[PDB]
Symmetry: C3
Subunit: 523 residues, 3 copies
């Protein structure tokens, strides 16, 4: 029994169902919860000997690295795989296109299913090369930043991979932002180019996209050129001559292959803004964390198919709609529309349509379907799923049991992934087919994450279980953000200085007698 953790008193360990293993294509990646702690204890006491080999296994290098880990949280100088060189789009596209060009890559589901398509890895290589050819033709090169203002569709996945192909950092801007929020993000990074579309389709209603760009671009002198996709092909849309150009028109000029550009492990892969602050992520570190978590926390295999019902304007689409799954050579499902269009059975038609084996979504949608589309679940077949995931905020133990039976049929594993934009990948989450669940908890911290609670009053680490306090990590990890663009002081003041030697997550949590962490919300 727990005197402190009131959430822990009387909670049955929900061992992973037996049908989860009937549906695995191959022997699971970690046998039992006992091997997970042998691999975890090594990843904390011996990061060099744990992440080194994994980096060599999961990523393809253009130059080997000479030092696995360097720096400290106190000094904000973390670095991983120093001296190595790779390319993000080579690991996400090329190396799978060479292996099996016809394997699906981007299973795109448009607003209207009448506008849906699928890109094989061989097609994704030809389209990324042509868009990278355009950007290279325009003078975009390693060290530049390129803004993206696109809905959740193929064009966004291609623009990011194309920008990363040249060694430039893509700064994705959620399609729903205003001209002001566009102006602020473009000017902070001094983007030299922007990729966008004429207008989108969000649940039947068409959205003004180019209009908001033009309104914002009038205060963005750094933007030399804009690439515009024809999502609707509406001719009343204005393109300023000499600045704006058409996706289809430019890409038609360049070949289906462009060489990737090697970047250093610690070269910025992208900027993502949360005044807004631009979180910066390294290349090697972020990519490894994205691939590891997707392989272990979701139990992804070459045959699997991931449907992250998120958006690339946020970190969830970055890591688990794009980089995570494509690094592993599995197809990912890119959903442009809403969970209510045409009706509340769209998520479920798609899972049935493509036999998706993993589903990843935030609770905020589970409360929308629990309070509207609870009947549409039985229409469609959801027998392909092994793993179901929660991302956004905490997951009610109510919605947990709802998410488990209605969508999972009491046959799936459920992983409640805790993590922020600054972490890059999952921090605390239960591994599919390994970690038994406690409804409402994130469970054990992931490889390389040395979680710890700190008494906010004294600022000392709270040893022993059955306790609460501020959540903090005692060392940095590969996918940790390395700075805030052009403002490292705010980066230190926010994460590294409140508790020297620790990384301040900004949340409060509790650890029960079993070690399971309970996320008690922001402080």
């Amino acid at each position: 029994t727990h005197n402190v953790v009131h959430e822990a008193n009387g909670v049955k360990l929900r061992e992973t169902p037996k049908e989860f293993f009937e549906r695995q294509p191959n022997k699971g990646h970690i046998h039992d919860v006992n091997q997970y702690k042998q691999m975890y204890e090594q990843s904390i006491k011996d990061p060099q000997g744990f992440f080194g080999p994994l980096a060599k296994e999961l990523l393809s290098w253009d130059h080997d690295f000479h030092t696995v880990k360097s720096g400290t949280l106190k000094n904000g100088d973390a670095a991983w795989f120093l001296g190595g060189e790779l390319n993000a789009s080579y690991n996400c596209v090329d190396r799978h296109a060479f292996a099996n060009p016809d394997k699906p890559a981007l299973i795109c589901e448009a607003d209207d299913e009448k506008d849906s398509h699928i890109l094989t890895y061989g097609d994704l290589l030809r389209e990324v090369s042509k868009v990278a050819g355009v950007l290279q033709s325009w003078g975009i090169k390693k060290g530049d930043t390129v803004a993206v203002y696109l809905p959740m569709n193929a064009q966004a996945i291609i623009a990011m991979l194309a920008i990363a192909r040249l060694g430039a950092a893509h700064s994705v801007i959620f399609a729903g932002f205003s001209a002001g929020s566009i102006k602020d993000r473009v000017n902070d990074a001094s983007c030299k180019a922007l990729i966008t579309c004429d207008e989108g389709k969000r649940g039947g209603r068409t959205t003004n996209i180019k209009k908001l760009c033009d309104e914002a671009l009038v205060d963005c002198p750094t933007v030399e050129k804009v690439l515009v996709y024809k999502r609707t092909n509406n001719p009343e849309i204005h393109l300023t001559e000499g600045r704006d150009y058409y996706w289809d028109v430019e890409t038609a000029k360049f070949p289906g292959y462009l060489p990737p550009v090697s970047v250093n492990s610690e070269d910025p892969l992208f900027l993502l803004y949360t005044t807004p602050k631009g979180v910066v992520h390294s290349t090697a570190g972020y990519l490894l964390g994205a691939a590891l978590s997707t392989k272990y926390i979701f139990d992804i295999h070459p045959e699997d198919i991931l449907f992250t019902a998120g958006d690339v304007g946020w970190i969830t689409g970055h890591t688990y709609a794009l980089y995570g799954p494509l690094l592993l050579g599995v197809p990912t499902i890119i959903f442009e529309g809403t969970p209510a269009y045409p009706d509340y059975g769209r998520f479920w038609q798609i899972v049935e349509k493509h036999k998706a084996t993993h589903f990843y979504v935030a609770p905020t949608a589970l409360r929308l379907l629990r309070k509207a589309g609870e009947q549409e679940i039985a229409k469609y077949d959801l027998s392909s799923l092994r793993t179901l995931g929660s991302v956004g905020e905490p997951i009610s133990p109510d919605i947990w049991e709802w998410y488990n039976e209605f969508v999972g049929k009491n046959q799936c594993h459920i992983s409640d992934t805790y993590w922020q934009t600054e972490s890059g990948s999952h921090l605390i989450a239960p591994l599919a087919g390994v970690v038994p669940n406690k409804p409402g908890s994130a469970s054990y911290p992931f490889f390389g994450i040395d979680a710890a609670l700190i008494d906010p009053v004294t600022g000392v680490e709270i040893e022993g279980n059955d306790a609460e306090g501020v959540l903090a990590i005692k060392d940095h990890w590969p996918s940790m953000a390395r700075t805030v663009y052009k403002n490292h002081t705010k980066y230190m003041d926010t994460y590294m200085n409140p508790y020297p030697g620790y990384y301040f997550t900004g949340d409060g949590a509790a650890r029960d007698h079993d070690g399971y962490y309970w996320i008690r919300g922001r402080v």
Copy 2:
């Protein structure tokens, strides 16, 4: 006997003379024709196992490659030696300078022999490094393009190698071109710099070089600086302060070594313009093709000396005057003048002077020397020669016999080489000392070249020998051109789309019972509309048969649905009467998509108009008419 390939009837096979092997420095690279077929068959079925090792033998790499071959013709994404890095100037200069800096590299014969000279590989490394140093200090870098407007002399070779040393792509503009032809090519490539000379010398006559550049440059805003070599040192030649700088003045400021810049295998090495279309060639694949063909088709050894009587303004000078021979580390003769100056024995005086072992020339020049200078050949010792090459057009059996008797004394091997600017290197040619000749035939296709004859109407491959049709290639090869600069769609529409799954040479050919290919003339207008091959020339004739039409012009343009579409412009309801005329005389599917009637052939203008001898005022009415 042959019912189709009449050229081949009663043609005695011509074995390589005994003197060829007496003059050969070492054992030949291929023992006999049976070893050649074994090697060729592997180059087709297993290009990875064949070209992989050769790329590691013949080229020096800064970064290893992980995949030999990628892409398909149908997708226009061919690539070779992916992930690899190298430098063209290192493989053509540095590595040979280190091994033997005193070995001759450029044997330069000037317009007047008084000005001839010889650069060793050591000399070439210093002179290339110094020019590259100037370009580098000017801001030229990987990704840029630099134009070259120079005669066929040492400075042209140095300029090309210095540009490639920085990872930039050179674009060589033949020195005979006008100011307008210069204007078009510089602007299409947006060259940041130009390398040229004040004036040229050709046949004793002074040519204006800088004068035409100044004339062109007024409309080339991308050119930031020009390097000017004092070829004549004429003091009346004006240099624009702030833009033009002297070759000798700037090179004096920089050292004789500059580190080469590594580039990717598929980074552009150069643009070569032919509306002129800028043919783009890769780095690794092109260089491997240049070395392989020069080695095996001409039988080049380190002891040899190559004289390619061509100009770097064309692909022949690119591949077989520069990259080919310098990659293999042998000396190459760079001839600045003409075959008639000071007299009609100059070619042969040069061979004798430098004891050249290999001679490579176009049939056009052989015809001129046969007509006006046959008496001069016997005056010179040409016994150093072993291989006689022919380039640019099929060689008549008569010209073949003349070439064989009067130049080779019936003692040399003759290699009629078929290829084109877009192939980078030889496609069909008799390997020196290996393949016996049939006069007028190019014989067998080369390594990596899977040649086929396809029916021009159906696009289906013709099986069996004693056949004729369109010459097409079933898979890309290392030195195949990769795109047209900033215009990959024209590249696809010209080479890959007309006959999908094949490369379209634009030539017709025939294959005899021994598998020897006989290049025929060019094929005609092939416009492919939903699988129907249409003739724009054939449609114009039909429209003109209508007594209401004075003149008619038909062209082809890209179409997202049907592949291509034919648009007919007509100079004099009526549009319906003309479309039926074409259906009856040609065929039902030959009707133009559209028939536009205008008030007033330079079709280069109609293609750009419909896509969206001079009389420029009509252009406005045609643009208005197409909309109407």
Copy 3:
């Protein structure tokens, strides 16, 4: 054996390295004995590929391997080493040591006032270099650019140099004693895109103006886009130009403490160091990356006998090549601590050098004979106050060391227990050329002894231009083949490079020095042959000083020459003719030279004459001014070949009257 030519060597007892040297040596020496050295030297000459290849792979960390050890020839000016190789200078001097031992001292910084002293570990140095490199990167600095440095000899100068080299750019360090005109010359010749400087300096307790001289020069340096200013004094009265000048502490705060180093080619330029020549224009000497670094590591390791446990105190300034190679690159490459002294040997008193050695138990001390002369004159009494027993190697740099100063150095600083390394070299050699290896080569006081690895030294007859075979000889000192750390060019002026070093004696490198070789093969430097004047270790251009004096509108013509000086080694004497209080104007002209070049270029004396001796062509005959400034007027010989032989009498009278 007696010498008919090398008189310096007659009756000179050979001086073995004392026994106590090896007692204080931490490990087995890097070279077994002098016979192993001869074998290794012979291979470095006959087989440089087999010798320098392995050493380059031991001492440097490479991002890409090299395929050819050595290329090019002196005659063609195309020397190159380790071709195809890639590396980074800041990685080899910082990163690789920080990963191994982040807490090991790297920069032992002794400020002008010891109250301000501090110590940076290799870990600290990595963060501060990364932050400065981060600022430069955000400003647009990239491989191929040049960045000027105008800083005193403190930690920030070292960080600026390493941060510039981290990006693949080349730093150009401008000695802090230079005026705005000398800053102007160097920044414009190199077209520096940025400048790193400080608000004010501290030297001898007195505040020096640094930023003020930059603003004065920068008004004519249109290539400089941004300036980084360190708050050395934090004086708030120092103006920063909005849009151009930015504070070191403010900008570095914006960037993280790690930045990836940029790989550069072995032959990409590492730095420019502007040097005075026979013209009035400084020539920017350019050094490669790989070859220069290998030379710094090789010489520092084998000539000084540096081990990981050791601590090096090079009493030099990064404004000159001595600080470049043996205060920064040499010791940091080997991963040992180096003492960076910002002050003077006289402040607070004439024992400061020894307080520093004792404080930090320095094992290696490297100093100029000019300072040894000063301490013998004014501070000998201070030595007995300090424990100097940590020292074992005592070096001398920049000028000839008198046999007397050698003995003083040996007895009073080394207690007759240390090895002395008289090191001969020059800015253009990058590293040592001729020097006694510590613990290996016995000394002849005043001789540089044997040439170092890769240095094939020769003496050339000045009359015939042919190499002199056999020993007991003298002539022009020349080197028969290039070496790894040899300078590669003069910036954007390779013709001056060829005309100065390679063309005078084709097939050879021309040091500009004369020398003699005794029967034991020891070399004895006889000084410059090319009328280059060395004042307190500072290479000066008499032509540049003449130009400064003429800028005064009262001067018609001026001639400057060099003469021996008991204090500074040599002194420049200026003869001035006016167009027309003398001692007054003499002060106004000396100040004129201070304004245009720097305070350390000021003439010792200014003699005012009516006419300068001239040829019939009209050129000034400085050969006569030199013999007069010395008491060798009786060696002038026939002067009827002058166009004004009567001026000679007035020159002898003027020098006698005004010198003093």
